[PDB]
Ligand binder design. Structure first.
Ligand SMILES: Nc1nc2c(ncn2[C@@H]2O[C@H](COP(=O)(O)OP(=O)(O)OP(=O)(O)O)[C@@H](O)[C@H]2O)c(=O)[nH]1
Ligand SMILES: CN[C@@H]1CCc2c(ccc(O)c2O)[C@H]1O
Lengths: 265, 310, 337, 54
């Protein structure tokens, strides 16, 4: 009973992610700041359609597809993961620019600037994932990866090379050190305004708290254990790694439901 | 003619091309509507922008104001040679000027010069300028008094509304005699503007104009506010008072008018409505940053409110 | 003194008594045997974009192919309905515009607004440069409508309870009309251009005479302001759209109101009315973001056009009765067929 | 002043006019609509082959 019902659970998560992202994308398809949300929704839909069904069969059981197919999947995983995270920093920067500098907000950002920014960030995200996979330069030299590299039906991930650290540094460490400062400045600006109101005559805390906490709780353990396991002498089990990776994947299912709260987005 | 479609396509292109350039300019401007009662100071504030922010029949017009003021005072007394005749010049009639209608600029002309005269215009009066490379667009609809105000639905997209009131006119009737004193007439206009169907998301900047005349009226013992406003007897100075450098009597009078305007605003204001009271003198005060500093608050508050933060 | 006011009541009572005698039978009973029109449904054919702000004015051309629109961004664009291609874009001296027109010969376009001045532009000129021809500036208060009797005469209706018949060549008022106690908001010329009406803000409408310059009749059946008016194609009746939910149809010969159009759910106002080619359908705009289609002889709603994201402020029907154009406040025009 | 005097003189002009019964006006309107209902493209839809906008 338990294996097949958990499979029912994976199927349910997949249907849900696909329906939500697709509906939001269709209603949006329009503001200067909605292009980033559309990109996030498109990346979420692509990841949900391409990664979870493929990983479900491997988690349940032998990898039927070929070596090239497995390489493509384990390469697109990084591209999908790093594409959604990098957009949140852009959204935070845009909000900070809009609030802190009201008059220059119209002049600073335009459709062409948004297109250039989105193209640059997508190119940066894509260059990190597919290039090492095609080059095969990141392959580990340990005695445990030889079996996986030799068997076309066995799939596993291992990288003791520095690449894992950079992957994290440029996937997850860079966005948060900026987002924390951005939202702290936004909160400070909001706190000044109420005080001014008092002389003439907290939902903000809750919304900033949820916005931070969702992605923080979803993604911090994964990028913690990812750095931890390489340095340590196998102190982390592979199953726990897969479970934490899936828990991190869950974030994209609910991220479009966070934003778009305003009715009839 | 294949050519006929080609030319038309070419003509649509030039027109569509300009409308792209015009869109950027239009979206980066701020429009400020002026409202007030009769003889308040809406025109003078606009002139203050043309004298410092940006950039002759005045001589004849100035003489006409002096001529009209000369006959008004002497008429109520019963109830080159032409200028010299009125020069010799009745003083007690000018002292009791609240019992009839008389122009404020009568004393100065008879005894900032170009901006002290009064001129009445029916057409819309407009002004454009820049202060910090940010476009601003100030205009005054004006005209003779209208009690329907059916054009107010047009101004449904302005950034803010500037309101000007005369704070030294609490003992004078307006137009037809026996009516309510001018200060009460301004209050009734404020309620209609504040509780308006179309203007449900527009902020109001309140200018309490003509402060210099208020100080001298209270200093003299001519008229007391308690007579016209009975509720002034029980009024007390608010604890959160920060008077500039003033006598306690003058400071109390300044606020009682201000807090009396506020109780209308706070009653029906549940979000998307703010009032910013200021104490200004139109002719003398030299800084236009008051509008600039305020206009940066409506935007930010609007953005902050946007996104659910506040 | 008081005797004149005493006689005013007697004359006022005399008019009502005369109208009560002529009410032989209501129009509802006589047309009870006419088969209903049914259900009328139309789909958007063309959408015209290119305006930066809300729109108040719109008028077709004699050829029923070109139309002109006005908006408060400072532009007066002329479209080509068949192929959706702009032809002209005239910048304006003032940013506040409330009306526009189109000459019968297509050689002129009129405009006006809060600037108290009516402006006339030239289209067919040497070197292809549109320039202001004349500037009619004698009024006080804003303007509401402009109509072209010919290339030399234009009728305006300012906001000081007056109307005038101008003259472009001399730029002076030939005649002026008085009698309204409230702001005038609309007018519509007769098919023979011999009479016209005007819906004021005092819940009344009159029937002026172009030549004699005197009032002829007065209908006072409404209860609020009046925003629109239009003649029947026959030329002996007109329909009125007031601030309340009701719209009424008056008759010149019988000098009485004939029918009333209202619905329980509708509690909004009306901003524009117009008829069809044969005078069988009475379209009418509304403030609740759509346009309804009534029936002239049955008072039965027979369709709704709700493809707009903002209130409808203008409406018109081509001279051949092939399309209906409805502007709105979201800077979008539409063509229905 | 004499505003009332002007008003009453105007009202006397409209007091004496020729009026007809409502039945005749309704019959005229119904006859006109019935006669001209043939060429009403909005009322009776025209085929798409003869529609300039389709
Ligand atoms: N003493 C004094 N007079 C002022 C001040 N501001 C405006 N005025 C008066 O304003 C006069 C100029 O005409 P205004 O009263 O401004 O006329 P206006 O503002 O065009 O009148 P509205 O059409 O009602 O706006 C001056 O002669 C002064 O009497 C002020 O700060 N002090
Ligand atoms: C186990 N699948 C991959 C492997 C490593 C990796 C992931 C996500 C983001 C990264 O920057 C990574 O380096 C995981 O989703």
């Amino acid at each position: 009973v338990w294996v097949v019902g958990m499979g029912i659970v994976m199927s349910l998560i997949v249907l849900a992610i696909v329906f939500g992202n697709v509906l939001v994308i269709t209603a949006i398809a329009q503001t200067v700041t909605n292009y980033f949300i559309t990109s996030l929704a498109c990346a979420d839909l692509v990841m949900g359609l391409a990664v979870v069904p493929f990983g479900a069969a491997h988690i349940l059981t032998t990898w039927t597809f070929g070596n090239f197919w497995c390489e493509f999947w384990t390469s697109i995983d990084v591209l999908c993961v790093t594409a959604s995270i990098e957009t949140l920093c852009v959204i935070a920067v845009d909000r900070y620019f809009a609030i802190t500098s009201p008059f220059k907000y119209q002049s600073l950002l335009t459709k062409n600037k948004a297109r250039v920014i989105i193209l640059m960030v997508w190119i940066v995200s894509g260059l990190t994932s597919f290039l090492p996979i095609q080059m095969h330069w990141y392959r580990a030299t340990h005695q445990e990866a030889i079996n996986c590299y030799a068997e076309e039906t066995c799939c596993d991930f291992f990288t003791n090379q520095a690449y894992a650290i950079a992957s994290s540094i440029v996937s997850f460490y860079v966005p948060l050190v900026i987002m924390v400062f951005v939202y702290s400045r936004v909160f400070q600006e909001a706190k000044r305004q109420l005080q001014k109101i008092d002389k003439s005559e907290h939902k903000a805390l809750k919304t900033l708290g949820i916005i931070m906490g969702t992605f923080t709780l979803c993604w911090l353990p994964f990028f913690i254990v990812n750095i931890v396991h390489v340095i340590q002498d196998n102190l982390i089990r592979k199953e726990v790694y897969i479970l934490l990776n899936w828990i991190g994947y869950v974030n994209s299912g609910f991220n479009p439901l966070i934003y778009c709260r305003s009715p009839d987005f | 003619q294949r050519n006929e479609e080609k030319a038309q396509r070419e003509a649509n292109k030039k027109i569509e091309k300009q409308l792209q350039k015009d869109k950027q300019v239009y979206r980066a401007t701020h429009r400020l509507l002026l409202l007030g009662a009769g003889e308040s100071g809406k025109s003078t504030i606009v002139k203050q922008m043309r004298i410092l922010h940006v950039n002759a029949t005045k001589v004849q017009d100035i003489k006409n104001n002096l001529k009209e003021a000369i006959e008004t005072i002497v008429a109520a007394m019963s109830n080159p040679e032409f200028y010299e005749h009125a020069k010799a010049l009745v003083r007690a009639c000018y002292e009791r000027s609240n019992e009839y209608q008389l122009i404020d600029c009568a004393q100065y002309f008879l005894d900032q010069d170009l901006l002290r005269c009064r001129v009445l215009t029916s057409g819309i009066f407009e002004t454009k300028f820049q202060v910090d490379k940010v476009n601003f667009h100030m205009f005054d609809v004006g005209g003779q008094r209208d009690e329907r105000r059916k054009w107010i639905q047009c101004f449904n997209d302005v950034t803010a509304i500037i309101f000007v009131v005369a704070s030294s006119s609490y003992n004078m009737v307006i137009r037809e005699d026996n009516q309510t004193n001018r200060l009460q007439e301004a209050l009734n206009l404020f309620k209609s503007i504040w509780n308006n169907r179309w203007l449900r998301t527009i902020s109001v900047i309140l200018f309490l104009n003509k402060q210099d005349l208020l100080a001298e009226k209270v200093l003299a013992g001519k008229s007391k506010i308690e007579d016209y406003f009975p509720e002034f007897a029980r009024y007390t100075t608010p604890e959160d008072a920060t008077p500039e450098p003033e006598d306690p009597r003058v400071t109390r009078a300044k606020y009682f008018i201000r807090d009396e305007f506020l109780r209308i605003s706070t009653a029906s204001g549940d979000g998307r409505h703010y009032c910013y009271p200021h104490f200004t003198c139109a002719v003398d005060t030299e800084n236009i940053r008051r509008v600039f500093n305020d206009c940066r608050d409506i935007i930010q508050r609007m953005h902050l409110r946007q996104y659910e933060l506040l | 003194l008081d005797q004149l006011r005493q006689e005013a009541e007697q004359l006022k009572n005399q008019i009502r008594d005369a109208r009560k005698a002529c009410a032989d039978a209501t129009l509802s009973q006589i047309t009870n045997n006419i088969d209903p029109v049914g259900r009328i449904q139309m789909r958007t054919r063309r959408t015209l974009r290119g305006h930066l702000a809300k729109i108040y004015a719109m008028h077709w051309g004699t050829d029923s192919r070109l139309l002109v629109s006005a908006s408060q961004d400072g532009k007066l664009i002329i479209w080509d309905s068949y192929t959706t291609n702009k032809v002209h874009a005239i910048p304006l001296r003032s940013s506040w515009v409330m009306t526009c027109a189109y000459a019968p010969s297509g050689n002129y376009v009129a405009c006006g607004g809060l600037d108290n001045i009516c402006s006339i532009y030239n289209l067919k000129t040497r070197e292809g440069n549109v320039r202001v021809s004349r500037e009619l500036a004698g009024h006080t208060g804003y303007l509401s409508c402009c109509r072209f009797l010919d290339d030399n005469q234009i009728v305006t209706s300012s906001g000081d309870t007056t109307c005038a018949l101008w003259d472009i060549e001399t730029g002076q008022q030939t005649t002026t009309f008085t009698g309204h106690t409230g702001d005038v908001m609309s007018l519509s010329l007769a098919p023979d251009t011999r009479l016209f009406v005007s819906g004021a803000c005092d819940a009344s409408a009159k029937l002026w005479d172009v030549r004699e310059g005197m009032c002829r009749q007065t209908f006072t059946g409404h209860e609020s302001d009046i925003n629109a008016i239009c003649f029947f194609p026959n030329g002996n009746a007109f329909a009125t759209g007031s601030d309340d939910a009701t719209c009424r149809l008056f008759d010149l010969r019988a000098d009485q109101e004939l029918m009333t159009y209202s619905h329980d759910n509708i509690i909004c106002g009306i901003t524009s009315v117009s008829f069809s080619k044969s005078g069988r359908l009475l379209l009418a705009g509304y403030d609740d973001f759509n346009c309804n289609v009534w029936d002239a002889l049955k008072a039965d709603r027979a369709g709704v056009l709700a493809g707009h994201d903002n209130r409808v402020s203008c409406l018109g029907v081509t001279d051949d009765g092939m399309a209906v154009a409805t502007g709105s406040w979201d800077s979008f025009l539409k063509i229905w067929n | 002043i004499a505003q009332a005097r002007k008003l009453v003189e105007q009202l006397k002009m409209e007091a004496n006019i020729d009026r007809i019964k409502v039945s005749k006006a309704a019959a005229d309107l119904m006859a006109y609509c019935e006669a001209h209902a043939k060429e009403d493209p909005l009322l009776t839809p025209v085929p798409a082959s003869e529609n300039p906008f389709r």
